[PDB]
Design a binder for this molecule. Sequence first.
Ligand SMILES: *[C@@H]1O[C@H](CO)[C@@H](O[C@@H]2O[C@H](CO)[C@@H](O[C@@H]3O[C@H](CO)[C@@H](O)[C@H](O)[C@@H]3O)[C@H](O)[C@H]2NC(C)=O)[C@H](O)[C@H]1NC(C)=O
Ligand SMILES: *[C@@H]1O[C@H](CO)[C@@H](O[C@@H]2O[C@H](CO)[C@@H](O)[C@H](O)[C@H]2NC(C)=O)[C@H](O)[C@H]1NC(C)=O
Ligand SMILES: *[C@@H]1O[C@H](CO)[C@@H](O[C@@H]2O[C@H](CO)[C@@H](O)[C@H](O)[C@H]2NC(C)=O)[C@H](O)[C@H]1NC(C)=O
Ligand SMILES: *[C@@H]1O[C@H](CO)[C@@H](O[C@@H]2O[C@H](CO)[C@@H](O)[C@H](O)[C@H]2NC(C)=O)[C@H](O)[C@H]1NC(C)=O
Ligand SMILES: *[C@@H]1O[C@H](CO)[C@@H](O[C@@H]2O[C@H](CO)[C@@H](O)[C@H](O)[C@H]2NC(C)=O)[C@H](O)[C@H]1NC(C)=O
Ligand SMILES: *[C@@H]1O[C@H](CO)[C@@H](O[C@@H]2O[C@H](CO)[C@@H](O)[C@H](O)[C@H]2NC(C)=O)[C@H](O)[C@H]1NC(C)=O
Ligand code: BRN
Ligand code: BRN
Ligand code: CA
Ligand code: CA
Ligand code: CA
Ligand code: CA
Ligand code: CU
Ligand code: CU
Lengths: 715, 710
Amino acid sequence: PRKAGVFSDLSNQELKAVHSFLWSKKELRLQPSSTTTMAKNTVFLIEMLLPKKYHVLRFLDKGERHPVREARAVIFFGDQEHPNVTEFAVGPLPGPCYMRALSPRPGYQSSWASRPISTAEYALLYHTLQEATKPLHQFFLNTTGFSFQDCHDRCLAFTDVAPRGVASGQRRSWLIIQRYVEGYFLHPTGLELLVDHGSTDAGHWAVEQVWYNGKFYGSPEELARKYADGEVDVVVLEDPLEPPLFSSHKPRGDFPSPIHVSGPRLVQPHGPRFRLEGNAVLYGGWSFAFRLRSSSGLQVLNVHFGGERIAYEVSVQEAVALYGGHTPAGMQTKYLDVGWGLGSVTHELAPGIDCPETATFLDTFHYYDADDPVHYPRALCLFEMPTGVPLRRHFNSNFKGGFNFYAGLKGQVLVLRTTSTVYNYDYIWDFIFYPNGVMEAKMHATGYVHATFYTPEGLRHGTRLHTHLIGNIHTHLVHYRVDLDVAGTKNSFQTLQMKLENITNPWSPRHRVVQPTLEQTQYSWERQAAFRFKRKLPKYLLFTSPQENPWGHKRSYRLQIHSMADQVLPPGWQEEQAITWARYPLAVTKYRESELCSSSIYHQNDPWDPPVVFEQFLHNNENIENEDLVAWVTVGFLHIPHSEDIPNTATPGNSVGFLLRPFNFFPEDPSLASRDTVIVWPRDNGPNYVQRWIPEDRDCSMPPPFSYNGTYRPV
Amino acid sequence: RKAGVFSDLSNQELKAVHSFLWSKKELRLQPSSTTTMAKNTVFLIEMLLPKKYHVLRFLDKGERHPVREARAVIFFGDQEHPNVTEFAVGPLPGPCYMRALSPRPGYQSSWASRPISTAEYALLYHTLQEATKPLHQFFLNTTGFSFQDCHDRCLAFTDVAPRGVASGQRRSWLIIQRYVEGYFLHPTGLELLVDHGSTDAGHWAVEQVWYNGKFYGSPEELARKYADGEVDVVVLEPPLFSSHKPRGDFPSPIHVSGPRLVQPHGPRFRLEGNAVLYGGWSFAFRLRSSSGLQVLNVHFGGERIAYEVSVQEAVALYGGHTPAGMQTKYLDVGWGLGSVTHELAPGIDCPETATFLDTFHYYDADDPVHYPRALCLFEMPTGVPLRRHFNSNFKGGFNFYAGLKGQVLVLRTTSTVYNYDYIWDFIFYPNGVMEAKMHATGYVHATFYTPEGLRHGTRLHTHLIGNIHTHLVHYRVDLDVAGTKNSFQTLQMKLENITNPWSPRHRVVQPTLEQTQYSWERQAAFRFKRKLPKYLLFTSPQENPWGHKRSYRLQIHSMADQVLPPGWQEEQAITWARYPLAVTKYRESELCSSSIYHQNDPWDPPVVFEQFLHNNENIENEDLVAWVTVGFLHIPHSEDIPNTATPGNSVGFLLRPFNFFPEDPSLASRDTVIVWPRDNGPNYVQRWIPEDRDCSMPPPFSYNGTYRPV
Ligand SMILES: *[C@@H]1O[C@H](CO)[C@@H](O[C@@H]2O[C@H](CO)[C@@H](O[C@@H]3O[C@H](CO)[C@@H](O)[C@H](O)[C@@H]3O)[C@H](O)[C@H]2NC(C)=O)[C@H](O)[C@H]1NC(C)=O
Ligand SMILES: *[C@@H]1O[C@H](CO)[C@@H](O[C@@H]2O[C@H](CO)[C@@H](O)[C@H](O)[C@H]2NC(C)=O)[C@H](O)[C@H]1NC(C)=O
Ligand SMILES: *[C@@H]1O[C@H](CO)[C@@H](O[C@@H]2O[C@H](CO)[C@@H](O)[C@H](O)[C@H]2NC(C)=O)[C@H](O)[C@H]1NC(C)=O
Ligand SMILES: *[C@@H]1O[C@H](CO)[C@@H](O[C@@H]2O[C@H](CO)[C@@H](O)[C@H](O)[C@H]2NC(C)=O)[C@H](O)[C@H]1NC(C)=O
Ligand SMILES: *[C@@H]1O[C@H](CO)[C@@H](O[C@@H]2O[C@H](CO)[C@@H](O)[C@H](O)[C@H]2NC(C)=O)[C@H](O)[C@H]1NC(C)=O
Ligand SMILES: *[C@@H]1O[C@H](CO)[C@@H](O[C@@H]2O[C@H](CO)[C@@H](O)[C@H](O)[C@H]2NC(C)=O)[C@H](O)[C@H]1NC(C)=O
Ligand SMILES: N=C(N)c1ccc(/N=N/Nc2ccc(C(=N)N)cc2)cc1
Ligand SMILES: N=C(N)c1ccc(/N=N/Nc2ccc(C(=N)N)cc2)cc1
Ligand SMILES: [Ca+2]
Ligand SMILES: [Ca+2]
Ligand SMILES: [Ca+2]
Ligand SMILES: [Ca+2]
Ligand SMILES: [Cu+2]
Ligand SMILES: [Cu+2]
């Protein structure tokens, strides 16, 4: 379990050591992230940098030395004539000595414009709006009762929209103005503002355009004039500050059948049946390591069942929400969450609500837009839960009023979970491990919708959810990397289909038999295994090893996709360059260290010219017979908002993902080693014999009282 | 309870119908168990639901309880021209009439169409025992088992349906097996075709024999060829591979029990008879002996959503290298899908905290039969919150955390006809979402291994091929969204390409919302070839407060496709499987998509779903019925030994409110917890129900395993 350490995230200590090394280089002229100027040099992100697979596998499988441990460090060089973002690999860990260039992109000139927004930048944007919108102060008070200047409890706020412009190198953002109340996401005022914030001198930033209640106005001063002159159709909003606010989670209404007591709960008197130690997990047949990459999110690594490898890596790669709208902000919105630190917004899981009270909760540290490493309490959880359906069961009737036996194995599953709450939405990320060698990836969407001011024109792009509220139509798309190494690194890909044959009936020659046969298709080249949404996706998608099981069949794992995704943007059109992976529910590539990721932190703010274009991995149409293969999976769903999304979208029916299932991999059902199986046998003239291999449990235990902290701070 | 109008017959009611019929001396009734096909016998008795018109007047307009009746299916085999006829028997209590149902003028295959029975199997065994006598030494040498003086080493058979090549035939391929633990997986390589059409079992014959890839004409011919050395013969303590007994070792052994649910405060749903209340939900249920589980009169928040959600048919369609294998198209309603609801094991099949319900069935029995723990009803945590939000202040703290623990109510039964166990769930979420689900487990339908079999299946063991097949299930979904009169619409996203209104040299290419209305049945019959829209909506004319039509959305979870060619022979029995979704106008003559007769006369069955669309009726503002096909291709693999497992082996659908309620309907729940920060103190944890950490023990495990008259 020390070996799983090669995959582990950086400790608080290691993050400090990397940060100190960087700070000791006086030439870098580094300032804290919190300093309120853009014209500074700052370390924006530090996270572990995974060593090459070749070296990790020699360490894991051939006894060779532990590879060098390094950190990725992203530095924003804003304090120079030509600002840029540059990345370094810092190592070794422990004892950093060097910083070497990482992911260089020579000849590209928009790296500064491509960079993620930061807390300092938001502060400066607030200052720009407080100044720029002075002409509108009375307009604000009259229409909303709230303001930007001299406010305390009745403040206007903004939600920014990305991407930020119409071409590579621009940083011009539409801002949706809202009333800062409980669940403020759902309180747009009808004003939206376009701000050019490209310059490293915030004094140059300007509101370049204004939209209010269906019209463009050019400047805050023009809107103020036209309002002063009685030429603006305004919407005066009611005061929001007994009954709860519509955007609140507070209970209201009554069910016809009163529920006064707590529902049923899990108890775990015997404690966990999995072994978690550091970032290593053992659970029955399973063995795996996990990590939480600050940039991109949850990964499980080096996944084995029964002592044989199934997958080197299964990871979240990108999460997108692609909008339409009647408002300029709405029509602009294409959120790419890795551009916001999808793996860094792993906020505190509430025991008994977010995970069972019996779960193991784990803390982590992130360094993402921070002055020091920040402690995130209960960022992850791991728990076993009964599924409520048996893994297998059979009643073997004697067809004479009794039975020969009943057999069953109670359903349990191991769940590794984190969340991501970048702003309005909360995504719940699960990897799930069944005792029979089946593993599942799942995402559940909850939290608040991205919403805009209601006008009649909005109904072509959304649904009216409240008096002044439209839920814009959009699609959620998530990309997973699935580096299966089925029984080893060298695999092939094949599909199975049912095809009818029409033959003479062998026992009645005047007749025909029209019946299913089993058809196998082999794939030799990447392009053949790149399935577009328009193409028919076969029902059996197999990743095979050349090794056979005892019955002469190739040992395989099967991929099963659960999605309602489809092609959203036209292939090849503008921002679609950033999400070319979304063309493919499934694509298979040959492994390469230069293609470890389908997205990046830079994609959100330069979608026109990003550093990774997934389609390019298919350009060379490589041979994929007996190679190290990587499956890439797109799952998703169209979300047309509806009134039941108020105040939050709920999880039921709102999940997507995929299963990996053994297919001729094992000689028989690998759950057979479980001792939880029960078989009941009849006895002549007596009570039945209940055969067990583990004693019946009726024991009891209690969880600790509920607590919740809510803060995340350096330690 | 008004829900009683939907309830199954009690033990008392079944006896009353049975006594009444037996008091009619001219029916010449004999018990199901009598060992002859030349008898008249009552095969099935179940409740016959009254017409929807009368039920809704009773429920909604305070009118009289409808007349309660039974369906009685009588096999008239003790006459020159045997047939099956069905009767409405009533009223209940105190039956005094017997009215014949559903005549079919010109149809001549009634008798052949009828289900198989225990007495018929007993006669088939006798036939095999006599007919295979010449093969006695062949059996002993090749298998060590036989049909005669065999004791603990007996051969058995698995029959296959349908039974012939045309309407009116009763000619069955029988797969010979060794009768050991999990005998399903022990084929010997012999298959026999028996003609058992005659009501005189003395006339039944083995008309054909297949052994290890060759046809042999008769048992006598196979015996002589064996003796003459002209047959390629296959001659056949850890647990048996077909046993569920544990073997092997995990790398990290588990020696203790896993987590379990406790319910110290009792159920949070109310069950009274067949009526359920849970949060916003009210509904009734029944277990129809012929066709299985139904939920009826489903309300959320005092408003109707569905009049009926019911299992209609469950099919498994095979290909194979052996005659039995290539013959097999199982239709489970022809075997009493709702009658094989065998005992649920507490803690394994349902949680130990579940409420288990008994039922009575009269299906191929001498008297009504008590089935213990036939169904269960339980609430369980889903392990994922129904909703949650962390409202960051983006400065190292929070404004609040809000969450609602996930719970669902599950109504469950099973069906084990023979080898497979189907687990049928209807699931109710606190936010007005209900789900139907079926999970497959148990033993696969398997045949004897030869190399030629690998074109139709997978080798699973030394002598065993798992044959390729598709499972298909049909559901009837009679949604009455806020009322009987509904329309059907779909929503799609479509891109527009416009001038960027704030940068005119550029374009905005973006999503718009496109609505499609449907006027005629045929427009709403979606074939597997056709693209299924992402939003399938059943709509009321009533609007919510935001001016959008109150609707429920259907979301299908399936891997099904077109299996048999439309129009070809047995496909006539499963025309519904052309459509993942079809929408019809409600009619009393179209309550079911299948029947107990479809299995044994699939060429000319009494209900052809496609015909329901022939008149292509208007579906604007009508009583609509949605019909849903879900299923999956199952290519067997070695992990299916000894049994297929449930993970990833489930299909079904969701019904989700869509602009039906003004806001999230779960907001009435008092389980919600909100955590608020406080100046210079601990956070305030706001609750509307006290925190509970109590634990209790469930009942100790018991299992009976018998199902008998009481
Ligand atoms: C992005 O910005 C970084 C940091 O400003 C650039 O790297 C820096 O490049 C400069 C000039 O090429 C190096 O500065 C010094 O230049 C003098 C020239 O007289 C030379 O004699 C010194 O030896 C030294 O190289 C500087 O070392 C280097 N800084 C770091 C931390 O590597 C980077 O080139 C910019 N990227 C792009 C693509 O423009
Ligand atoms: C399976 O093949 C058979 C034989 O080719 C087809 O049966 C023939 O169909 C045509 C009608 O289109 C008849 O005129 C012939 O008399 C039939 N021949 C025989 C030998 O029966 C049959 O249509 C095919 N079925 C399918 C579903 O493909
Ligand atoms: C959240 O967690 C922090 C860290 O444990 C708590 O900070 C502690 O506050 C208590 C006061 O009860 C002191 O005893 C400790 O010295 C504090 N430690 C640090 C490192 O600050 C904090 O109180 C918790 N906040 C809430 C709202 O529950
Ligand atoms: C099926 O057989 C039944 C019972 O033998 C027939 O029903 C009888 O029909 C005769 C003459 O039509 C009536 O006088 C009897 O009263 C009927 N008996 C009962 C119990 O209903 C019936 O005609 C046959 N059905 C068909 C389609 O031939
Ligand atoms: C959206 O519409 C615009 C305008 O019709 C299309 O852009 C034109 O494309 C042609 C051929 O590529 C060019 O020669 C014209 O100069 C373009 N016109 C303008 C005004 O830009 C555009 O291709 C369409 N985009 C999509 C994805 O359909
Ligand atoms: C299964 O259930 C039946 C019904 O309760 C049990 O039979 C009863 O057993 C008691 C105790 O011996 C007898 O006194 C009664 O006469 C039986 N009642 C009836 C109605 O038959 C039976 O023992 C149970 N079987 C098993 C194996 O647990
Ligand atoms: N899903 C997303 N990527 C996403 C959606 C909306 C969004 N808007 N954020 N706006 C936003 C505005 C101000 C602050 C601040 N005071 N620190 C923080 C965030 C940011 C990201
Ligand atoms: N899925 C099905 N419908 C189905 C599958 C297989 C099947 N075969 N049954 N064989 C079978 C044989 C003998 C008996 C008897 N001794 N009573 C009962 C059943 C019957 C039905
Ligand atoms: Ca390639
Ligand atoms: Ca690989
Ligand atoms: Ca019709
Ligand atoms: Ca209806
Ligand atoms: Cu959404
Ligand atoms: Cu199957």
